[PDB]
Design a binder for this molecule. Structure first.
Ligand SMILES: Nc1ncnc2c1ncn2[C@@H]1O[C@H](COP(=O)(O)OP(=O)(O)O)[C@@H](O)[C@H]1O
Ligand SMILES: Nc1ncnc2c1ncn2[C@@H]1O[C@H](COP(=O)(O)OP(=O)(O)O)[C@@H](O)[C@H]1O
Ligand SMILES: [Mg+2]
Ligand SMILES: [Mg+2]
Ligand SMILES: [Mg+2]
Ligand SMILES: [Mg+2]
Lengths: 847, 850
């Protein structure tokens, strides 16, 4: 079929939608040529020509070169110049471009088509210093990019001429000086490769095309595609384009810009421009580029034409654009455009402002603020700073701003483990290596005693937004004792610690965290997301601070309240749980449970007070007993699948009798003060329907006994958590007896894959390397496997009970691809951590 | 609808198939009456009358009593005697019976229908001492069984008259003496309950029927149905039957027999008979009953008629029969029959012999030897006794015969734990309580230093067939030190020990065990099972002794060879495994693996040598590293859930040099053993496959090391590589796995664990409680769960076969021996079941019985 697509004045054979055959670069070059912008004419060789090149043994196919000669005749016709003609020279650039921007592709060669004769005619036409400088550039770049010669061999001949002649800067080289450096660069070819330089532009061009195709199979490119699971791309496109020269004088240059400020969203051009240079010299950092307001004054015609063109591109693409442009003697040329990268604050503002401008609607605005944009705006702060100002023990460097509260761990292994166990971990070490990065991503905060603002932990944490305090030197860490000292004060492993990476303060114990999310444009945006979403969002709240904090983020109820987290209360809660954990005769056991209802009823009262009017779904006692650390009988080989959940609750029914009485008694109590209370009881680890029915009998019994204490007016629901794969297999029998389902996708992933999350680190990252797992199954839900159990359990459940409310309270409630999947299956709510609530609120809206 | 079914001379309204409405007793009474045997006439009240009684508030339904009177008119017409008529008295028995033999039902009342007038007429007709003796029996039984008076209150009036009169035995009481004891028994009623005895036989009968119906709701019956998951039976039947009298004199009696010997299978009548007694007096053990050879001589007409009737019953039912019969004045009467219980040895012999007689065919013979019969014949023995005769350290009592080889444990907790972990455990304790029974069922052998042949461990172990040595007194056990001493010699926990419960010998260390299965009738029987079965049976063999031992039991190959079990050999294997277990840098790791191929290739050579000609399926290294028992090394190996940790193919994709090692070992031993003409069909199984990419990774390593190994010589060996289906996700995405796999094998241990969410070693805190309250109908680790795990087995087999038609699908879990599971795997359409070597014949029988 057709594999060469031209583009020129007002016409182009392709468009912005054909990125698979033309890459974003060639596609957008065609689109800008169609729109009518001044785009240098050229042609694009298809990615299917690259696929055919890579499969026929690195050769051009028969028709390809003649088809290239056809497109070159089009470029030569429009430019009125032939390749290799010293009278009317046509100089080219060879550019790489795939459908996705990626490393390993061949760098662009500029000023192609030069030799001694052409430079003579070019110097005659357009100035000598320009011509020999461009020929210097060509020899350097062509040898570098096509012939594999290092750039250093050319730079050393440059510095050698600067020394031998006594010149200082590049600008102080004469035309004859550059004419000699041309000869030196030509000699580099013979000195390095043993072959002289191609004088024939047709062979120059062919070697450049072959090199761009060869770059598709480059090791850096193969490593990028292998490490990012990047499939489906079958090649790169080659863009041969006529040269415009930003180095003919001081009325020429090269520049880049965003059409709006990518950090702040401000509707002002944000770019750089360098006078008398080519290509990527504005980004290379040797010469200092100037801002656009400088070009407004010294190149006014090109700046007016630039503002015009940027207004046209925002109108056409309907988005903020990242642009490359080049001016040749006051005449502007457009050479690349694409949708510009921006921050979260910029994405929100540009989105909202573009709605107010009538450029896009709200559905596209929701689809243009990524969840990673929104994550940059949900970093927590401390509730009241003056509360901790007396608990500050140390003060280091404010490496990455934020606020973290967690437990002290001294290894990245324990950080991955404690994050998998549900703890909040603060990784304290003298310094961080890349071998720690995995655990560094698991920790809520990082604390190092070494390194500065450009430390490893500092830079790494800035990329993530994690809180980090660096170079806190008064800390002395001791990994062998699992302790660090601040002066005379010792801090052991597992102790609570807080970090203010904005001020660099190290703070004792737990502190109150709050969301800051105050932006007016953000409030409007999340208003759009709440209107557009079908799926509801609940929260995973245990403490009453987390309930109000969750409700403030827009939560429509609590989908999971863990009762075991109620035992982080005080001396009187933590010490009393040991009584039930070391119970012997059920007479001895009933003395610990019946001495605990005020210990939980007031705790539950805190939850109902914050969440009045919205459903609160409380689970029963899930985890096993031997993690509140006689003790030999409690030790288990696999505590993930041991005496746990409803299994300790059918055995030992007095625990269920206790906590179910606490929830109902707090429900009646809080209901009398006008607080509307809709409670739900969730039974964990249901694998058989008789397990559920046993807990329903205990729930109905204790409920009717509790409704002796006053009026019985409270209507309630009882349901299961779907954690066990068998529950999904026999859900038709479970759904008849259940009021709601809630998928526990942590335990369901664990038992479906056969993975213990705490023990997965010895192989998991290795599986991610070799493409065995496309994603982390604990972060992203597995649609082909676990998803079938979610699908069948939902279908069987609904078919056995039409009024069945089905949700999910796993860690997957925040991940956007998972939330997209749960809307696919047709769930009613997702439940996630309180600070993750807005992420789900956006993810539920983007489908 | 119809609720009373009569039975009498040559006719009966029911048949042996109507056990739901008539119970086995009433059904077989009807069947014997139809065949033409002398069965006393009576009637059967349906179980539906019992169901309706239990739901209407303990009352008779409307027409039932008139319906009972219709059947009694039939019984009265045949016997020529009316109920309550002193001229022609009809005496009855009231018998219980449900569809399944079960406790809690009411014991039978005999001699019903007596009072002062009736006994006067009965004494006038048939003898006085007979009549008052029968009236004595009636008051005693009727008060005991219907009125809830203890039997002791009647027996003490008997012994009180024997004391006050000076008589010794029952025979020395005259008619007038029994006539007085009758008055004493009547007074027992008033002394115990405050009410006198029912004189009206119609009220006597109604109270007896009400009592049988009430017995269905008795606590012992409710406990039996609750503990054995017996649903759907909705009542018991009532059999009212005319009395025949085995106590009229010395030409009458009661007897019982099996038609053949239930222990040995001998085709000779095996029974007892007691003269001048009623009902269960032959079994009660107060008087000494006589054998049938006595009855042959002193009651010849009844014994000819008895042999005739037993020949007729074996002909009709086509089985060995358990019978009750009663003689009244040289005339034989049949009162109960049913298929007799017998042992394994008897079941096999009677089955085979009945085939040779052309009474039953082979299909029914296979369905008449239960797997629990066959388990009584597969108890292992030692390979050569003389080998250990010099290692005997102690000698105790031969409590229960057998042979056990295992590790020494000192608690029932460690016995349950070590049996769940896969170890063979020998429970050594001073004596055994019932609190140990659970662990006693887990141990391969029991050793006690106290108690005799009737000890707790002795009797318990005889019921199971487990090896037990009792009362070995020269042993001194110390549970706190985890040790026991024999004289000066100390034996620590975990040490290997062997026991011969047949001779009572205590033996040092491991010994070679062997099957004894030598019976010619058994060999013929298992020949029939092998012909009838579709499903193949493989073995789970690791040691070369287990491979030949398995091949001897009829195994058609090895379905699972655990490579980790190759390391439990000697100093040079157990010490070398610690090198690979403590490997750090892959230069350090490759020094332990490459120094181990002869360590495993000779081990594998032992397997190929025994299993020439049949497929051997070897799995890769399954279990995690941290169970081969350093501060930086042992902490990295400690895991929270070692069942789902760095395990199986996960350490084998990570650290690919382990797979590169053992895959080279299997192939090099394959070529080596193939050159000596031994036909070798090897198979490589990759465990814990959850993603198809895990499998394909191991296939690339398997194909690579295979082609490298075929540089050593010829590549003539064609092989198969496949997965074990342990992970539920593998069943969910089996369509992608079957394309890259040559065979599947379901690991139903791990699959049950991950499907239910159960850790087997941690299930004891709740499992038996779940078995109580009917939450789990069966143990999911012994019996396969069809509604749940079975769906994953079903879909993985269907998807696998649909993606690869030549896919051989089997199973090598513990469920390969359970008959209900094997029945299920034939249902799904598997190709083989693989199980332990001594369990091989059980599967061979279970695969045949469908
Ligand atoms: N034909 C041309 N005339 C002038 N400048 C060009 C031409 N082709 C490319 N350039 C410029 O030279 C540099 C190299 O281009 P390119 O490698 O396409 O950018 P990218 O960094 O996306 O790969 C850029 O500054 C680009 O604008
Ligand atoms: N009508 C009868 N005449 C004589 N003997 C009877 C009569 N009914 C039952 N028997 C005998 O009395 C005893 C009662 O047996 P039964 O307990 O009814 O059967 P089982 O306990 O086996 O279910 C047995 O010895 C039986 O043979
Ligand atoms: Mg560019
Ligand atoms: Mg859970
Ligand atoms: Mg009987
Ligand atoms: Mg396994």
């Amino acid at each position: 079929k057709k594999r060469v697509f031209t583009f020129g004045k007002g016409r182009s054979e392709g468009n912005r939608d054909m990125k698979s055959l033309l890459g974003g670069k060639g596609a957008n070059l065609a689109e800008m040529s169609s729109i009518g912008l001044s785009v240098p004419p050229g042609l694009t060789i298809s990615t299917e020509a690259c696929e055919e090149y890579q499969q026929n043994g690195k050769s051009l196919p028969p028709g390809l070169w003649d088809e290239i000669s056809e497109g070159l005749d089009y470029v030569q016709k429009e430019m009125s110049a032939s390749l290799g003609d010293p009278s009317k020279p046509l100089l080219l650039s060879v550019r790489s471009g795939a459908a996705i921007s990626m490393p390993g592709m061949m760098d662009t060669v500029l000023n192609l088509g030069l030799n001694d004769e052409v430079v003579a005619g070019l110097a005659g036409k357009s100035g000598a210093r320009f011509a020999y400088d461009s020929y210097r550039r060509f020899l350097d770049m062509f040898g570098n990019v096509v012939m594999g010669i290092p750039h250093s061999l050319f730079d050393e001949k440059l510095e050698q001429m600067k020394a031998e002649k006594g010149i200082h800067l590049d600008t102080d080289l004469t035309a004859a000086d550059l004419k000699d450096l041309v000869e030196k660069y030509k000699n580099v070819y013979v000195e390095a490769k043993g072959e002289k330089f191609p004088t024939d532009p047709k062979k120059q061009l062919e070697l450049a095309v072959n090199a761009v195709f060869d770059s598709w199979d480059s090791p850096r490119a193969n490593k990028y595609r292998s490490i990012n699971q990047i499939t489906g791309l079958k090649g790169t496109a080659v863009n041969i384009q006529s040269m415009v020269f930003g180095n003919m004088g001081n009325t020429s240059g090269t520049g880049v810009l965003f059409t709006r400020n990518p950090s702040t969203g401000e509707k002002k051009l944000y770019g750089e421009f360098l006078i008398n240079a080519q290509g990527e010299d504005v980004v290379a950092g040797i010469r200092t580029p100037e801002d656009l307001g400088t070009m407004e004054t010294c190149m006014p015609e090109a700046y007016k034409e630039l503002v015009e063109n940027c207004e046209i591109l925002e109108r056409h693409y309907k988005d903020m654009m990242d642009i490359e442009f080049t001016v040749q003697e006051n005449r502007l040329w457009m050479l690349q455009c694409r949708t510009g990268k921006r921050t979260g604050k910029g994405a929100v503002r540009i989105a909202v402002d573009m709605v107010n401008e009538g450029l896009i609607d709200t559905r596209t605005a929701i689809k243009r603020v990524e969840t990673q944009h929104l994550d940059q705006l949900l970093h927590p702060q401390f509730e009241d700073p003056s509360a901790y100002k007396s608990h500050v023990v140390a003060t280091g460097l404010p490496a990455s701003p934020g606020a973290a509260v967690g437990q002290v761990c001294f290894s990245a292994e324990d950080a991955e483990t404690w994050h998998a166990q549900g703890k909040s971990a603060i990784l304290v070490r003298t310094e961080t290596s890349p071998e720690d990065v995995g655990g560094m991503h698991a920790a809520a905060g990082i604390l190092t005693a070494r390194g500065g603002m450009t430390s490893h932990a500092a830079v790494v944490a800035r990329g993530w937004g994690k809180c980090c305090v660096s170079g806190c030197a008064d800390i002395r860490v001791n990994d062998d004792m699992k302790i660090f000292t601040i002066g005379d004060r010792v801090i052991k492993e597992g102790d609570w610690l807080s970090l203010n990476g904005t001020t660099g303060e190290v703070i004792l114990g737990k502190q109150l965290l709050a969301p800051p999310a105050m932006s007016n444009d953000l409030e409007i945006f999340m208003s759009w997301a709440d209107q557009a979403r079908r799926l509801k969002v609940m929260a995973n709240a245990d403490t009453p601070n987390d309930a109000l904090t969750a409700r403030n983020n827009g939560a429509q109820g609590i989908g999971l309240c863990r009762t075991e987290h109620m035992f982080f209360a005080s001396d009187e809660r933590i010490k009393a749980v040991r009584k039930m954990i070391m119970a012997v005769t059920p007479e001895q056991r009933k003395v610990a449970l019946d001495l605990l209802l005020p210990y939980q009823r007031s705790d539950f009262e805190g939850i109902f007070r914050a969440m009045d009017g919205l459903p609160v779904t409380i689970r029963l006692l899930d985890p096993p007993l031997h993690e509140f650390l006689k003790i030999e009988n409690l030790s288990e080989v696999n505590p993930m699948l041991g005496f746990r959940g409803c299994r300790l609750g059918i055995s030992y029914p007095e625990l269920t009798e206790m906590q179910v009485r606490a929830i109902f008694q707090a429900a009646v109590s809080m209901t009398n003060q006008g607080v509307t209370v809709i409670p739900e009881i969730m039974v964990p680890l249901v694998g058989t329907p008789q397990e559920l029915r046993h807990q329903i009998s205990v729930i109905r019994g204790v409920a009717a006994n509790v409704f002796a204490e006053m009026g019985v007016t409270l209507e309630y629901k009882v349901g299961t958590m779907i954690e066990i794969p068998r529950a999904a297999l026999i859900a038709e029998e479970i759904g008849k007896e259940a009021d709601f389902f809630s998928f526990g996708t942590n335990d369901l992933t664990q038992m479906t894959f056969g993975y213990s999350r705490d023990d997965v680190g010895k192989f998991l990252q290795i599986y991610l390397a070799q493409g065995i797992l496309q994603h982390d199954p604990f972060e992203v839900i597995d649609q082909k496997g676990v998803g079938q159990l979610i699908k069948m359990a939902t279908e069987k459940g609904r078919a056995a009970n039409p009024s069945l409310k089905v949700g999910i309270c796993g860690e997957h409630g925040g991940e956007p691809s998972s939330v997209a999947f749960f809307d696919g299956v047709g769930l009613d709510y997702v439940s996630c951590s309180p600070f993750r609530v807005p992420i789900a609120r956006l993810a539920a809206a983007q489908v």
